[PDB]
Design a protein around this nucleic acid. Structure first.
Lengths: 85, 60, 50, 101, 119
RNA sequence: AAACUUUCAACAACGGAUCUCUUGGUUCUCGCAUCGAUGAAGAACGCAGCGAAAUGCGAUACGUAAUGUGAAUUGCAGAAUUCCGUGAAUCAUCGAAUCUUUGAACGCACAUUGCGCCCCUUGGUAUUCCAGGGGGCAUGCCUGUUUGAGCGUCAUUU
RNA sequence: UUGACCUCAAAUCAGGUAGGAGUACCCGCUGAACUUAAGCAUAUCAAUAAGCGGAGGAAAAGAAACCAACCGGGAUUGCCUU
RNA sequence: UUUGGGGCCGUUCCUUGUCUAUGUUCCUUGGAACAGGACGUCAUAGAGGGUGAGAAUCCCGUGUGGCGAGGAGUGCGGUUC
RNA sequence: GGCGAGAGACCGAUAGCGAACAAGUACAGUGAUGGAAAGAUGAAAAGAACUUUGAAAAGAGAGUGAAAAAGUACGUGAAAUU
RNA sequence: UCUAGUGCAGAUCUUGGUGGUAGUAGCAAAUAUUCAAAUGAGAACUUUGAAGACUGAAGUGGGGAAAGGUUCCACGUCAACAGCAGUUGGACGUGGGUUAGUCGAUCCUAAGAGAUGGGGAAGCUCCGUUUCAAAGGCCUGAUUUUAUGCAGGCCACCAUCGAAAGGGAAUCCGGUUAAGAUUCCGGAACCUGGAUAUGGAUUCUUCACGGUAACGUAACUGAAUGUGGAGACGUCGGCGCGAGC
RNA sequence: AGGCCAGCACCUUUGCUGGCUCCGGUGCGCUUGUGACGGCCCGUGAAAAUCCACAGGAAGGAAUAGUUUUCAUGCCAGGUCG
């Protein structure tokens, strides 16, 4: 009964949600995410996990500041305001 | 019966009602509606009348 | 379960607000390519995995 | 070939000692000044069974000479020791059973 | 309809607070009218008017504090320049134009003369 | 002889090839150098008069302000003084702001929307208790300040 | 006694600073095997991939403890070539 | 024998707005003319796109120059202390 | 790689980036990771009033349209198979 | 003329699609259904009533943990699903719904995990959890420039996380809804924390009396420090007693 | 209160009024809790928080008035998540 009845015995989550990635990879008994490396400082990445990088990298989100960075570089990082020509 | 921020608590609700509606409030029972919101059942003293102040507000 | 956590309940509420069909005025708008919802989710068929 | 049992035994996740019911480590009183220049009296208050150990233990109690305090020790009981029993530890102590000469 | 930032700027602080509480009460009225009714956009006009009011107030306070900290160093970390981490951590044109008096002498005595070559 | 099987054609079907398209991709070239403790990348949850998503945004929530244009948005509804004008608009531009809870994440924690300490202030007849609001408390290191410790050590006391 | 010094410390002390991300190129460490050898162990794949640390718009290098043996040249990088 | 520093206007660089010619004449077909035909125009503009079908000549643009606005700035040209 | 521009004896929706579309999406897996399919009505919705049969869906007429041999199971509409 | 991703019958080829087999195998465990009425276009199955049967309290009953997530309840409703059917449904559509001082989490620590100091490691990070560390806060106040210093005094564990079944402060009845209730309504209680007034008690023998005693009481000063108890505990046997049945 | 019954009323919100709700017995009975004992062990069968008491005697207080708030009564509040 290594198959079906054991799958019936299967009901306790090894993994739950993580607060840095939100992916349900936070091993409770180790206290680590299997995807971001929480609660470590760094973010978990590998150059064999190219797809993983591509999935979790810059630009898959809002870039709440970084789009405006390039706009602002174009305008030369200016202070002040307009003058009502 | 009010719909309420998830950041709020019973002291806040009681004081806010006393201010906005010029009433006194006996007790407060809150819950989280599974649409994500908070709901508050707010019981006053027997002095005031909830019907009166609700059809004063302009809902009924 | 009954004894649950607020995060779970939060995600559940969001799911419940997602689980309903398209608006037909969106079906009416200009240049529209949407006919139906395809992010639709039913407890019998697929689980959230949370 | 595998690593074998005697080698796994040294990491010891499951081979560690089951150290719950053990009343403490059965060490003698510390050798401070009273022991190495005179003697000092304590009292065997209670003999008990230590788990994993076939020899019993004797919760002895002394007094602190430096403070109003009652530092309790754990001795391994010898044959003849009983409750309420005065234990004399030190250098000029007398040679009877239970003493720490 | 709604409100106008220029006349708000002419108005004073307490006038703005009164405007704000009025708008908020009106918006609560509008939400009960909304649950009674099918549709109501006047609530959206109200929303953006409240937003502009709070914006104006913020600008007034920040300008007060700017002209308070004026002409001295150590102004705070939300009235300073935002430019970028690296540019803030960079040198100044002063600190980068600093020289040894030695190199200043060598400059002044032997600078790149502007010459030309035909005859 | 029919029926049935098979074959061919016409019409109808299943199905989605062929043809013709094309806001995409790929490759080459040119040019510029711009993330973050002043809190990033990312994540979660939430915001529209009527939306689930996408895109946008953060309780000032498909956006505010400011500037420019110059009268639209549009699926519906509504709005009109907003039209010879400090002014429409899912407009463009963008120099002032907001920037929920998190995250290098920084009061201590975290499978808890958990538990504290300090300052200012308000109420409850309250330095102490309770609650509300506002502001704060990470670590390592640098320079400097103040308070120090050590017969490590100097002098000078009587 | 009082005041210095030396060294070591503490403060929610005054001011600042580093951390993380991205990583095509760049500086370094670390470090394989499949493979080729018609086998295979040196060797080769490779002073490579993976892993780790750290930067910029370029980096690194760089004004010779150099090349040379000439009638001598003259920082560095790079292209052709050798 | 030889020397320094600031201002201004220009100029350079960046960003960027706006203006800058020519047929929608006739006939046939067609649902529609951008097609065919006839007659013409501009062209330092016949590149490209759009519009009911192959559109230089309908629209945006292109080409040509022009007129501005805000920034960087010592690169330098004149002027001033 | 990032930001912005231009080009091609390139691919033309089983091709070309995995992704021309609400694609790193739905979905699977405890998890690391894996990872799709799916473009075209018509110039314009003018997207079929009205009558009739039917419980209705739909049908037959009518009508729109240049064309329903264009009816959201929509450009054309092969074959297998029927 | 140039140039190629240039010609398919095959590759247990790839992707998609389609067939014959074939209206076939088969839809057969769990003792079992029937009569009428109503609805509706339409009833073997929906609803009601009547009958016959079953589970038979170690149950097909009533409530929960893990998990699931809104399936809960209602109204409408049958294109797809419910391997027949369908007027029904855990389906489709639209809404509504989960009320706590006393139930739990939160607190405690267990096995254990894991920072700091320090030490290793090229380095991601490893060891270790009181360690070769200068590792802190508790109380009375003293002043009445005045807030909180200075007066003292005290102590030295020396992070934190870890159980919704362990330990643990305290709530019961009746009623009520479409769906909730030890939560809401009514009534009747208890606990913690913080304020405070009266009564009561006690005292001129200044901090209580009685009792031979076991010990009793409406209360009836008591800091630092220290000792002790409860928390705090196996299993089986038979006996007694109690509660409910 | 709740439960069992009776009576009189009405489109109806619909009730309204009355009574009873008593006294016992048994048991190796079932389940469960508990008490005092016994038996078993080379097995003797968690910890901490928290609470209380005691020893001790710092300190503080009465008389024209004090001391006490572990006695009684009285006042306020009791969050967050499920």
């Amino acid at each position: 009964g290594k198959g079906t009845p054991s799958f019936g015995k299967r009901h306790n989550k090894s993994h739950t949600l993580c607060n840095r990635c939100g992916r349900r990879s936070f091993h409770v008994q180790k206290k680590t995410c299997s995807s971001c490396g929480y609660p470590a400082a760094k973010t978990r990445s590998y150059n064999w996990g190219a797809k993983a990088k591509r999935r979790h990298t810059t630009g898959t989100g809002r870039m709440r500041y970084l789009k405006h960075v390039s706009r602002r570089f174009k305008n030369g990082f200016q202070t002040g305001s307009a003058s009502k020509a | 019966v009010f719909q309420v921020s998830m950041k709020a608590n019973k002291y806040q609700i009681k004081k806010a009602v006393k201010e906005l509606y010029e009433v006194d409030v006996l007790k407060v029972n809150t819950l989280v509606r599974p649409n994500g919101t908070k709901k508050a059942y707010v019981r006053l003293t027997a002095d005031y009348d909830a019907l009166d102040i609700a059809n004063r507000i302009g809902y009924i | 379960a009954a004894q649950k956590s607020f995060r779970i309940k939060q995600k559940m509420a969001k799911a419940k607000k997602q689980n309903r069909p398209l608006p037909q005025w969106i079906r009416l708008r200009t240049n529209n390519t949407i006919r139906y919802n395809a992010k639709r989710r039913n407890w019998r068929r697929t689980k959230m995995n949370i | 070939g595998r690593v074998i049992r005697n080698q796994r035994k040294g990491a010891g996740s499951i081979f560690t000692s089951h150290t719950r019911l053990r009343q403490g480590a059965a060490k003698l009183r510390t050798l401070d000044y009273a022991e190495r220049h005179g003697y000092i009296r304590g009292i065997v208050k209670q003999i008990v069974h230590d788990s994993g150990r076939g020899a019993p233990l004797a919760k002895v109690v002394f007094r602190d000479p430096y403070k109003y305090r009652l530092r309790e020790e754990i001795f391994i009981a010898n044959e003849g020791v009983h409750t309420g029993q005065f234990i004399y530890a030190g250098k000029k102590a007398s040679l009877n059973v239970g003493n720490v000469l | 309809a709604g409100v106008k930032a220029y006349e708000l700027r002419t108005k004073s602080k307490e006038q703005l607070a009164s405007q704000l509480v009025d708008l908020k009460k009106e918006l609560a009225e509008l939400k009960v009218q909304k649950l009674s009714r099918p549709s109501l956009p006047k609530i959206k006009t109200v929303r953006k008017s409240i937003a502009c009011v709070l914006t104006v107030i913020n600008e007034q306070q920040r300008e007060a504090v700017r002209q308070l900290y004026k002409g001295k160093k150590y102004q705070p970390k939300d009235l300073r320049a935002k430019k970028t981490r690296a540019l803030r951590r960079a040198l100044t044109k002063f600190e980068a134009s600093q020289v040894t008096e030695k190199q200043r002498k060598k400059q002044i005595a032997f600078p790149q003369r502007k010459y030309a070559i035909k005859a």
